[model samples]
Target: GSSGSSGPLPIPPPPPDIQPLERYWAAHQQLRETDIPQLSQASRLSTQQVLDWFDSRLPQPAEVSGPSSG
Candidate 1:
């Protein structure tokens, strides 16, 4: 009855709007529950994608970040 549910839902194609709020999560590894509501409601532009991102988790790739001061 539930085999398909967990069969192959991993990916169809990565989302597009992930940029706006995605990087925000990267900046703040952990955020305040209060503030989250603001960002969640402030735009709400991402729609239920908010929860989608949560499920996808905070996974990211290197964008050439530098720790050494220039």
Candidate 2:
């Protein structure tokens, strides 16, 4: 039964082996630069399909993970 939990039931750890898809993300900082074709080559995903995935996820730029300078 669903308990109305929006988040995943449990946090999942990264896989044991290499993940080309995630590697693509790691290689590029901006989503715009990480074009579909590039991801397709690296992750073996169709260019159009990769584009759609990025669209849905809408890469939110990395936030400052440390204390504010201000």
For TM-score, the strongest prediction is 2
Name the runs in model 1 displaced over 4 angstroms. 1-17, 43-52, 58-70
- Score candidate 2 by lDDT: 0.56
Across 1-70, the per-residue lDDT of candidate 2 in tens digits comes to 2345565665643433225556655575346544656666665566776666656655466875675536
Model 1 weakest 10-residue run by lDDT? 11-20
Q: Write the per-residue lDDT of candidate 1 for residues 1-70, one digit (tens) a residue.
A: 1334475575454334545466677777554555555566644544455655554664456586656735
